[PDB]
């Protein structure tokens, strides 16, 4: 009401896209909450043993 | 920890509140003075 | 944000900045001068006023008006852009309409009749002038 | 001796830790918006030192509180 629509429309578009990031990272997380954190397929366990080392 | 029920629900729920905001930013946007 | 980092300062840019900051200042101005004197005249002209309280808040008013005259004629003159036609009407007629307003209700207030019904639509005009005013002034 | 000692009580109850948590995290976050927001919608000519530096002062301290009470919920423990 009393704010400017300058600081309406910026506070809208900081609200829109941060619960856009925090929805994105919280629905890719699914397989933790189920089954403990732990890599999963045949090719993510190369990457990690050279990250590692 | 946290029943995948639950992260499911809120994920809708965030997911919902967020495409009817988009919808008011654009009702916003137009209205531009 | 204190780094300025430019290489070339360009003259408009710097114009429209101040003219908004300018705005911002007689619009913040504006609407504290109408709190100010609708709480005034709300608060000192229920039933007895002794013509005392209304006259310290007119001086009061006039102050204001005179501040945001001076306001005016800064961004008249120092700034490129008019922005003083509209902002001088809008301001004369303001400070009509609360001058009015107020000989209206210190005559209201300090007389044999009490006028509620002219009263209440001499707010309702002051109101719409204000809407205007706050319509015209983006 | 051990008799002379007597258990240790810990200070804050750890069944309180989740609402408390929230509730400053929450209050943390505002305080940051409200900055973020000051900062995008300001000239040059009109940026209050004061004003930025008292907000920015309550809002770290609100969000350091907020994440580490939130760490020690997870069971962290530190």
Request: net charge positive.
């Amino acid at each position: 009401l009393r704010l400017s629509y300058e600081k309406q429309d910026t506070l809208l578009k900081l609200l829109i896209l941060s619960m856009a990031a925090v929805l994105s990272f919280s629905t890719r997380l699914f397989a933790v909450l189920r089954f403990e954190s732990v890599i999963h397929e045949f090719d993510p366990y190369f990457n990690y043993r050279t990250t590692r080392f | 920890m946290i029943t995948d029920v639950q992260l499911a629900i809120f994920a809708n729920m965030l997911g919902v509140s967020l495409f009817l905001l988009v919808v008011l930013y654009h009702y916003v946007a137009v209205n531009n003075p | 944000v204190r780094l300025d980092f430019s290489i070339t300062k360009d003259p408009a840019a710097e114009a429209r900045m101040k003219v908004a900051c300018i705005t911002e200042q007689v619009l913040t101005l504006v609407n504290k001068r109408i709190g100010l004197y609708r709480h005034f005249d709300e608060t000192v002209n229920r039933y007895k006023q002794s013509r005392d309280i209304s006259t310290l808040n007119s001086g009061k008013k006039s102050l204001e008006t005179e501040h945001k005259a001076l306001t005016s004629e800064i961004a008249l003159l120092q700034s490129r852009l008019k922005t003083e036609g509209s902002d001088l009407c809008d301001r004369v007629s303001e400070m009509q309409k609360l001058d009015a307003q107020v000989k209206e209700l210190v005559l209201k207030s300090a007389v044999e009749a009490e006028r509620l019904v002219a009263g209440k639509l001499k707010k309702d005009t002051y109101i719409e002038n204000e809407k205007l005013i706050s319509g015209k002034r983006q | 001796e051990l008799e002379a000692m007597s258990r240790y009580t810990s200070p804050v109850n750890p069944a309180v830790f989740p609402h408390l948590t929230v509730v400053l995290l929450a209050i943390g976050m505002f305080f940051t918006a409200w900055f973020f927001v000051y900062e995008v919608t300001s000239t040059k000519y009109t940026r209050d030192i004061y004003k930025e530096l008292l907000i920015s002062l309550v809002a770290s301290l609100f969000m350091g509180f907020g994440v580490l009470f939130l760490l020690l919920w997870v069971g962290i423990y530190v």
